Each structure stands twice: as C-alpha cells, then as structure tokens.
C-alpha cells in the first residue's frame, strides 16, 4: 500500500484488507520518508501494543492543499465527493511526497477526481460513476452543455506545481474492533534463556516465577506446559526451541 507501483484515483480509492498477521509500525515511525504522520486516538508507536480484528489501508493520491481535508470533521471536494471520512475516525494518516514519483510534465492524466457530484458521499464510500453532473433544470441527456459537465476531472500533478499542488501518496490506516476475535497484533519481544537461577517467567500464554532447568519429560508436539496433581505448573515448552 505505502510502496505500491501505481496508485488509484481519489474517487477510485483502493482498499486492502489486512489481518491474521503481525504489523511492525515502529519501522514506519522511524522511516523518515514521510511528509506527515498523524494518528487519531492512539499514538503511532503504541500501535505495536494493541490488537485488532481487521485493518484496512485506503490509498489514493491528492494535492497538498487537500491533505487537511483528509481527517474527521472536514469539508472539501474530496471530503464530500471522492473520499469522505466519518466524524469518529481513529485510524492513522501517512503522507508521502510524490512530486518526484507521480508527477508528470504537463500534468498527470492517469489520476482523476470527481470535481462535481450531485450530493455528498458517506464515510468510506466510493463513487466510480461517469454520469454527467446536472446543475440546472435542463436535461443533460448523457452529453454536456449548459450546466452539464463530465464530473471526473484530471489532475495537474506537475514538476511546476508547488508544495500545495504536487501529488501526495496518501494512506489512511483503518482499524476495527469487533466481537469477532483479534487477528492482527504488533510484534512481541523476547530475550535469551537462563537456567539454574530464580527468575520470572512470561511465556506466550503463561506467566509466573521460579527456577528453570532442563528435564527428561516427554512432551507431545502440541503440548506447551504441564501441571501436577494439584493443578500447579511444573514444566513448560520453550516456544522458540522445542
């Protein structure tokens, strides 16, 4: 998503579902290859501590002035007609400068946007229609004329453009916390293995304290730990070494 070959338009904003895997966000915060990074509700580096159900990434390219419209409680041509956001957005926003990547001498015609719509969009709505936009009481009949214009319009992404008009590969990282189980989590840490010493234990699904030593017990390939007659732990299988 962040390093896609060819991004989609704004009215044709792509969405990629991510789940059932680990997501290392700390590399992004320390990448230093982004013009902006803004996370709503949660810190960007704290994302590695939380777990979610589903995570999407809405990608599109816009001009610099339209970047502020990409937020909850905004208004604009993109905030209304091409990609509208809700009022309770709590995902994240990452901005990459594409003036040297997606810019074209004489404007970039591969990317367009609905500069005209009959009304406003909904949160995370997409409208890929090519209906001629009517503004007056006359009928367009599919063609243009008085108050009848093709709504989609090309972009002026150019080396001549300024900071507020050059392209910007935008990626809005959506999050979901449903009753369904958590499927995406941050990366966990670890350390070396000590023995013959009173230490604390924090295993994958088990904690406690005690001294740890090798043993001759024969665990099964799927067994993680064991308990005694009194339902008390007395053994454990190391998760990184069988």
């Amino acid at each position, epitope marked *: 998503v962040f390093n896609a070959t060819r991004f989609a338009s704004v009215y044709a904003w792509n969405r990629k579902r991510i789940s059932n895997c680990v997501a290392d966000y700390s590399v992004l915060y320390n990448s230093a290859s982004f013009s902006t990074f803004k996370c709503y509700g949660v810190s960007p580096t704290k994302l590695n501590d939380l777990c979610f159900t589903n995570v999407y990434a809405d990608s599109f390219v816009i001009r610099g002035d339209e970047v502020r419209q990409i937020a909850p409680g905004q208004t604009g041509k993109i905030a209304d007609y091409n990609y509208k956001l809700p009022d309770d957005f709590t995902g994240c926003v990452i901005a990459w400068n594409s003036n040297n990547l997606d810019s074209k001498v004489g404007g970039n015609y591969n990317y367009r946007y609905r500069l005209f719509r009959k009304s406003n969009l909904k949160p995370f709505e997409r409208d890929i229609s090519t209906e001629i936009y*009517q*503004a*007056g*009481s*006359k*009928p367009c009949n599919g063609v243009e*004329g*008085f*108050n009848c*214009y093709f709504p989609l319009q090309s972009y002026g992404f150019q080396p001549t453009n300024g900071v507020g008009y050059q392209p910007y590969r935008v990626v809005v990282l959506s999050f979901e916390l449903l009753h369904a189980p958590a499927t995406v989590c941050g990366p966990k840490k670890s350390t070396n293995l000590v023995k013959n010493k009173c230490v604390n234990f924090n295993f994958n699904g088990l904690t406690g304290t005690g001294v740890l030593t090798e043993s001759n017990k024969k665990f099964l390939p799927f067994q993680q730990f064991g308990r005694d007659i009194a339902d008390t732990t007395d053994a454990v299988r190391d998760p990184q070494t069988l």
Partner: antibody
Amino acid sequence: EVQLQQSGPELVKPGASVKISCKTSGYTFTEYTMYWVKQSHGKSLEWIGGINPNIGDTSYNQNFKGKATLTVDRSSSTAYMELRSLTSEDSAVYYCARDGYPYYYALDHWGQGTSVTVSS
Amino acid sequence: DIVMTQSQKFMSTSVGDRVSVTCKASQNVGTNVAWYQQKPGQSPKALIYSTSYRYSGVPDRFTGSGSGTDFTLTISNVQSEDLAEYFCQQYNSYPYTFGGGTKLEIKR
C-alpha cells in the same frame, strides 16, 4: 429574504453600450444559475442567455450572439449584462433571473427590470 | 427552434368563473413546461412548473394538466388579482422559447 435589486432606467444614444446590474442577496450565489431576458413593448417575451457562476459556461441565443455578453463578479455577488451595437429596436425592459434546480423547481424568480430606451 | 403558439391573445371571464389558458409546442417538449403571471408594469412571478406543481406562495386554484403537445392552465375561482399577463415557457432544448401571452378581461 432572497432579494434581487437592479439598476435605474438609462437614457442612451444609438451605437453606445450600457451595463445592467442585478445585485443578489439571501442565497448562495455560486451554485444557482442566472438567466437574462428581454421584453419589448406590446410584443412577446424573449430569452437572451444564461451564465453559471461556479464555472463560467455561457449559452446565448443565436439572435443575440453579437448583441449581449455576460460577466459575473463573485467578489460582490453582482452579475452584469453588456449590450453592444444598439439600434432603435432595443426599446425594452431587461430582467434578471435565478434557476432553481437544486430545490426541485424550474424557477426563474424574476427581478425588477431596467427600462432602457434609445433615442437621439 | 420551438415555436410556442398561444391562441387566442384576449380572453374575457367574469369573477367566479372557470378559465383555461392553452399553448402548443412544435416538437416533443415532454413534460418540462412552465407558466408565469405578470401584473401590468410589475415583474413576472412564477405560477406552475413542470405542468403539475405549484410554487411557494401561489394559490392552490392554479392547476395544470396536459403533456407532450397540449398544455392547459385552468383556474377555478378567479378574482380581481387574477387579471395579469400569462406566458408559457419550455425547458427542453436551448435556447429557451417563451410563448406569446394571454391577457384576461372582465365581461361587461
């Protein structure tokens, strides 16, 4: 209260040019389309053209192509009609209008009218 | 362009009488026509749009019917404020072609 106020009556010599204004207040001037018409004395009505303030698209009548041009001033919400090559046939009143398509209408909502007479 | 013909130009109906104003079109205009009301000297105001709907502030006695070719602006209970100039417009193809006009009169 939506209100359209036009200019006063102008006495003009043949061959000259005038500018008829129609100030707008009470609504969003950018979206709604503004028309211009002409009513001669004792005869039927006739339509001249219409201008769109958000874009600038114009579509004049074919009998008024080299007769009238339209300019919109968004800095003060004032439209203008400039008549050229006047003759004795332009002894008429001129109204401004307002389209109503984003309100489930076909409305014109005519203004006041400027009586423009020609004589030497 | 479209030639909107009105016939006749004069009509005479007393108060409390039913009057019908008609005007024809040349080509297939469809549904989108209009009707207006012009007091002598004053500015015209809108009465009926799309031959089935009134405006905000006009009386409910101004009804309209007809489609395609014939259009009729029928008034049930006329008054002294009904005496005006009535025109008909089209909204089908640019440029807009207004009608001829019909003036009302009191019978004597």
